[PDB]
Design a protein around this ligand. Structure first.
Ligand SMILES: C[C@@H](Cc1cocn1)NC(=O)c1nn(C)c2ccccc12
Ligand SMILES: [Zn+2]
Length: 140
């Protein structure tokens, strides 16, 4: 589990969105595994607007942050899970790192801010849904 709280937005994995998220929906995209809802309170996370391809992510199944090198956002074929059939996921970045299904929502960041959230994984890989192209997260 996990979310990004920037401005009056909450960014979560689409497959983990709650009824309150769907009832206060701003934007969703199944191909990216992302959903954004509106919030009453202002958040403290800042979105990275950069070209970093090294950063750190939070792994809840280890209670630890790990440094990683990650690929550029791409269209990758992801295997079936209980939330999606096997399909192409867009704007996905892969790294070598431990992960388990419940680690989705953990933040990947660099010195510039939040880069994305954990969305896929297995066998020593972890995949992150990028958010750096969603420029509208920075404005009302
Ligand atoms: C919950 C789904 C979401 C999903 C996105 O694309 C299709 N399904 N993801 C997973 O199944 C999953 N995510 N991580 C971090 C893993 C690590 C090890 C094994 C499985 C996973
Ligand atoms: Zn950066």
């Amino acid at each position: 589990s996990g979310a990004i709280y920037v401005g009056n937005y909450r960014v979560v994995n689409r497959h983990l969105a709650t009824h309150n998220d769907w009832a206060n929906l701003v934007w969703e995209d199944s191909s990216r595994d992302l959903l954004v809802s509106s919030t009453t309170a202002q958040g403290c996370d800042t979105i990275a607007r950069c070209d970093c391809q090294t950063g750190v992510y939070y792994c809840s199944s280890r209670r630890k942050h790990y440094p990683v090198s990650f690929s550029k956002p791409s269209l990758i074929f992801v295997e079936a899970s209980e939330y999606y059939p096997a399909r192409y996921q867009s704007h996905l970045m892969l790294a070598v790192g431990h992960s388990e299904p419940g680690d989705c929502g953990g933040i990947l960041r660099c010195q510039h801010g939040v880069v994305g959230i954990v969305s896929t994984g297995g066998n020593g890989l972890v995949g992150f849904a990028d958010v750096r192209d969603l420029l509208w997260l920075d404005e009302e």
